[PDB]
């Protein structure tokens with residue numbers, strides 16, 4: 245079912261690719277061969293699976309960065325490294341004492357900063373982090389059954405875009421991360437949401453005095469207690485049960501939250517969610533009125549939120565505030581781009597505005613910090629549109645430099661046991677991505693962990709045309725963790741650092757060599773592909789202007 249390999253050296257025909265008498269390096273082994281009769285002979289080093297990464301021996305350093313050859317490392321900051329354990333319990337947040345499925349584990353920006361050398365060793369040149377912005381303080385019911393408390397550990401339940409989340413760290417912590425990353429040629433990307441704000445939690449209701457309960461006086465104190473968030477589900481109750489105590493009819497009480505002008509939600513005297521992608525409510529999340537031309541003022545509950553950096557601005561719509569608040573971080577810190585969540589659930593004008601502003605903001609920060617600035621490159625924005633494939637969609641005309649490619653995960657699944665089965669996908673992609681760019685992944689928090697490969701995931705992802713997204717732990721086969729009654733939760737398991745420094749050391753070393761080779765050769769990401777014809781194993785060359793690389797896979801050893 246797959247090309248085979250005797251295990252002996254390979255004699256490769258390089259006639260058309262490399263020059264006569266020129267030296268060629270297998271980057272994986274360090275072995276150098278001279279061309280004579282348009283031919284070279286090399287043994288794939290042990291632990292290579294029969295890989296040769298063939299380059300001109302001239303090659304000495306990484307190539308100048310291009311987004312079309314980018315290696316993005318996507319990290320859920322909470323589930324990576326806990327640098328500072330003091331911030332793990334911000335806003336009264338608690339571990340669940342069970343399997344920690346949907347709690348803050350305590351991973352933070354400081355801890356992420358401590359591992360930038362590790363990321364650089366993999367040839368990572370862009371770091372995409374979960375939103376570090378202030379989330380909802382409390383929890384909701386986790387999964388269909390409500391078997392775990394679900395906190396905003398993933399950065400998708402935003403409360404205040406103008407502030408950092410205390411669990412992630414301080415303005416100092418974020419500045420150190422961005423500056424240490426930029427010193428290592430690693431761009432910073434923020435996960436950004438504009439579609440929705442987080443659910444109503446007991447912690448936020450109590451702190452910012454919005455919504456209504458059915459419980460009054462001392463019956464309230466008996467049930468919820470001093471801090472309503474400390475409530476545990478009782479006998480014949482699930483973590484969803486607390487919603488039985490919340491009066492979602494109270495018009496005057498729920499207006500004290502975002503306000504009728506800010507969100508569509510099926511609550512009190514608010515405009516109910518629409519029927520189309522733009523105005524519908526995803527999973528009963530408050531849908532932000534991004535299309536509204538109505539001057540909104542600030543969210544009503546920001547009245548009881550003195551720590552906010554949000555200020556009322558004349559003529560400003562909810563959209564204007566959101567693009568403003570997100571742009572501020574770019575101007576202040578030099579954030580190189582955004583990964584945009586739920587791109588299909590927000591009108592295109594909103595995304596264009598965000599891009600215009602974020603682009604101006606990055607240009608400003610680079611002007612004002614020319615020693616720190618990597619280069620004069622514009623702000624990069626990529627989008628999540630569910631089911632988006634390899635296609636120059638309308639998104640590319642309204643401020644997106646690349647959309648996330650959903651199709652590569654399942655295409656690469658058909659090549660898990662056999663690397664050569666990807667060739668038809670790579671030919672298609674290398675050709676179409678001469679005119680535009682996408683961000684392809686094997687694993688995501690929304691889909692599954694690509695583990696059916698083993699260490700072959702390294703070559704499937706890192707040799708793919710266009711930008712590639714390593715999901716944290718891809719390099720270490722981070723196992724799908726406990727998930728309860730939500731099937732996706734296990735995709736966000738803790739980073740398996742014990743395996744990185746143990747049984748998965750071989751795999752990480754493999755990822756490091758491929759990723760470094762990718763960082764040296766824009767042809768991988770950008771080049772036209774010529775698949776070679778050999779009775780001895782699978783192979784291709786990629787050439788893009790200056791750069792030229794040949795990648796040979798010998799096959800299955802036995």
Ligand SMILES: OC[C@H]1O[C@H](O[C@H]2[C@H](O)[C@@H](O)[C@@H](O[C@H]3[C@H](O)[C@@H](O)[C@@H](O[C@H]4[C@H](O)[C@@H](O)[C@@H](O)O[C@@H]4CO)O[C@@H]3CO)O[C@@H]2CO)[C@H](O)[C@@H](O)[C@@H]1O
Nearest residue numbers: 384385387388443444484487492509510511527528529530
């Ligand atoms: O905070 C604002 C919202 O508050 C109220 O919604 C509650 C619900 O009462 C809870 O049930 C829970 O929602 C869960 C839900 O139990 C679970 O089934 C799933 O929801 C599905 C839904 O069944 C399905 O029909 C479709 O719409 O997809 C949904 C998402 O998969 O997941 C939900 C959350 O994980 O929590 C919320 C928040 O406390 C109130 O009724 C809402 O009107 C309001 O917007």
Ligand SMILES: [Ca+2]
Nearest residue numbers: 328329350352
């Ligand atoms: Ca921490």
Ligand SMILES: [Ca+2]
Nearest residue numbers: 522523531589
């Ligand atoms: Ca919407």
